[PDB]
Symmetry: D2
Subunit: 108 residues, 4 copies
């Protein structure tokens, strides 16, 4: 269970920077944010949504000072569509994760 659909809206659970084989990626927050997005692509597809249909993203971050770096990667995946809303929250995250992202997306 990587999320839930409720009248035409997909609410994802949080994706953390693990490979599908289940271990943490090596690299900085920007690389972790790549893995997270890569994980989100997969769950969006499975739900019948996509990045274009994301209406809200919640970024949980270990350190608010690394927001600019996460945001550089956010703007790569959301370059031709900008979710109408996003939030950034300081959170304690599973060992070594500097970022976790959940989304809310329309089911096409």
């Amino acid at each position: 269970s990587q999320g839930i659909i409720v009248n035409n809206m997909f609410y994802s659970s949080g994706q953390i920077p693990l490979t599908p084989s289940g271990e943490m990626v090596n690299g900085d927050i920007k690389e972790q944010t790549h893995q997270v997005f890569s994980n989100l692509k997969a769950v969006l597809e499975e739900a019948g949504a996509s990045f274009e249909t994301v209406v809200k993203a919640t970024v949980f971050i270990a350190d608010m000072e690394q927001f600019a770096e996460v945001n550089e990667v956010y703007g790569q995946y959301f370059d031709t569509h900008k979710p109408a809303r996003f939030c950034v929250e300081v959170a304690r995250l599973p060992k070594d994760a500097l970022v976790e992202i959940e989304v809310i997306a329309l089911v096409k």
Copy 2:
């Protein structure tokens, strides 16, 4: 409601998986109706809500906070029609003190669970 399962993404983390204090504020992890023996209270939703609140009391106490200092609660619920029952228990913990904000959200919860609550509270 319908669940989304894929093998091309790792398992997800419930975002409020660990409590944290930032700037005198305790943001709890989501409390599910687990007992100290680590089994679910598999009873009706009012029983499960009591257990959630018991777990909330502990994490608050541990964080130097209390129900009195809770400013926001978020209730994750399996079925929105069950809100009325959960809220009857909520009102026993938040009786003369009522958090200034609350939210209720349909979620897919860990196996069994009908209710999960997280809170945000001032540290004393």
Copy 3:
């Protein structure tokens, strides 16, 4: 609760002042108990709430949406105890369909308004 005012800043807005549609979602303005004549409604909280819901139907239909496509509601209320009375009127309009998410917030409303609701809804 205590209201804050300073001459050293201008009057605030209350951010849900006007509606908008973005990426097939309708984000409604906050709806108060004004009548179509412009009168603030002469009643208790339940009367006011009904007027809110009539103003909501109007903005939802006008946006190509309906109560049944509302995915989130936010209820602004002067006292959290009055929520049950608002919620009786809420449950009438969200009878068969229930929004997956809703929040309730203490807030200072325009004079005489004891309730204000905004919604977010899917424009199919």
Copy 4:
């Protein structure tokens, strides 16, 4: 008018780029964002809060692509202390206004 205090928390109403006399500020979105921050400063002081006790900011913006310049000004007032949470929301704002901000803060 400008916010409420409940249980030691100040919940500001949204501040737009008006001067205290009530005229809209003229200039780019950065200049607008400065005016909003001056207004928030004054409302926070009155509430018995400060930028340092801010726990959440909500930024209502006319368009997402201008968040870059809003954020540069946000970073000036929240430099030594960053709120634990912030949200950015596309909104229809009172005319001329490209940005509007509310905050939640400990008293």
